[PDB]
Amino acid sequence: FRSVISYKTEEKPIFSLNTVASADSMSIYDDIDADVLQNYQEYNLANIIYYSLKE
Amino acid sequence: DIDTAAKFIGAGAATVGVAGSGAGIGTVFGSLIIGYARNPSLKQQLFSYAILGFALSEAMGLFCLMVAFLILFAM
Incomplete structure (x- = not known):
């Protein structure tokens, strides 16, 4: 949603565990193991769906 | 007499x-x-690192055991 007159269609990417745990840009993030990423990927699925249902 | 007795304490x-x-x-x-x-x-x-570490810490301990014998047996 942008204004009362016009809206645009959009797609937001949804990453799984094996791509967020393997990305070498996630090496700076501390105290991370492949379980605390699963709980974080499962929650960020309900967010990007909720943010989508409001838009 | 004591030169040998000291080789049991030094060792x-x-x-x-x-x-x-x-x-x-x-x-x-x-x-x-x-x-x-x-x-x-x-x-x-x-x-592959626990072995490198086990070999390098044991290599220091066995230096002591070699000086234990090199005193007790060689001189």
Whole structure:
């Protein structure tokens, strides 16, 4: 949603565990193991769906 | 007479430096357990360091055991 007159269609990417745990840009993030990423990927699925249902 | 009696004390003291390798090899394999449980997909590469660490800490302890005998038997 942008204004009362016009809206645009959009797609937001949804990453799984094996791509967020393997990305070498996630090496700076501390105290991370492949379980605390699963709980974080499962929650960020309900967010990007909720943010989508409001838009 | 005492020159041989001193070779039983000098050799009993030299061999206690091995205690530094009983605690080293524990720290090496006490970290292969912690470090593994965090990243269990690197078992092949952690074990390859626990062996390098077990061999280098034991190599210091066995220097003591060699000076234990090189005093007790050679001179």
